Amino acid sequence: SATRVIQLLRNWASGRDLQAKLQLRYQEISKRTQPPPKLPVGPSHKLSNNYYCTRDGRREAMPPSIVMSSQEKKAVTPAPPIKRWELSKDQPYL
Template sequence: MPPKPPVQPRDISPLLQMLRNALLGRQHTLAIRSPASQAVRPRSQPEPVLPEGSLHKLSANYYHTRDARRDQTPPLLLVENTGAALLAAKKSKKEKKAKKEKAAADAAVAAEETVAAEGTALAQSAVPRPGQPYVWDGRTGV
């Protein structure tokens, strides 16, 4: 088998290359950077020597063990509050709620009796009303 010719970087046909160079007035430089053209360039610094990490080997390095979304766990229960104190707290909350409801009902009954005794005109005047609106654009006759 004959030896393969070296791989040329991608470019247009030779006829179009001559036309392009004539129109540009200079030799066109390709922007494609192939590994073959980069291999002849000297390197200004040596390759880095990095320490091997926990994920440097491919064996037993499964994606599901590195997935950050699977690292999340439910919150840990530090103190479990089950006992007499919890039941007492629930009972006291229910008692407070019942007292508030009873006080609100008594206040509503007292307000209704006051309105009926004093008349509707007095009750309507006791309702707070907003003041005059502020006319910021100078209109008249609001």
């Protein structure tokens, strides 16, 4: 939003088309006068067949499972070794 001559100066001193889009904001933003929303209901808003016992996350948690207490096999690992990642197919060398 300035003179064309300086726009060339800024576009050539920085070597890039800054005028296409700038740091400052303009009328491309959404207006702050939005119409009233109509926010949706949830999955459990069903009028029937919504008993809490079938969706009770808190009550369906068991105490920490115990495997050994003070009172031919194979050697295992907590998880399989982490898969070695592949180079970025988009661009592998910066």
